[PDB]
Amino acid sequence: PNFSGNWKIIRSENFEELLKVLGVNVMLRKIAVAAASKYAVEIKQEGDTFYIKVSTTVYTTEINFKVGEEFEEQTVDGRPCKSLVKWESENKMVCEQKLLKGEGPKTSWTKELTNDGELIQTMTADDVVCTQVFVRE
Template identity: 40%
Template sequence: MGNAATPTVEITLEGDTYAMKTITAFKTTEIKFKLGEEFEETTADGRVVKSTVTLDGNKMTHSQVGDKEKKEKDSVLLREFTDTEMLMECKVDDIVSKRVYKRQD
């Protein structure tokens, strides 16, 4: 079912706080963060991780650190923004998934 969902991602900036909302037919998640500041995030699959987001030009790096006591893995989400799309790559250990989001105006 997850692969059949077509998500919409809304990213907004108010002052120095970003909000990133991911909407699917099954679930909506939202995080709010300031660049470079660690925050607690509940992922779409229910894990609670420590996250940090940085921005370098048009590339956003979102690092998620899992709970080591629960043997959760760390992950990195790389987002690259162009005029027409957002390219996202998610890495966990040596596993990589990629997704392309088309920009809607």
């Protein structure tokens, strides 16, 4: 697998409904959906070590992990969590998250490299799955 690259979003589905389950009110949900249209992912993969930079027009954040090793990041609605990534297949990984403080919906994400050169990311809160599709810049 070579997830490394500069990825630009081409399609984003069910993001508003994800934010709804996480308790974001409607006006901010719409504003967030609009930001998701301009959002980019930079990945550097070496073996099973990943550096991921997620950026929008005004915000950037870095995620660093090695597959199978616990790390700390934040949920989609911004709460800190402990995360653990495992492979599901040659080109798909899955992340399970656990809140450090409090309760909330069960969240997770996945990344997949398709045979067509697309990157598919999903983010889940309970029953609702957001699917986002990227191509290399």
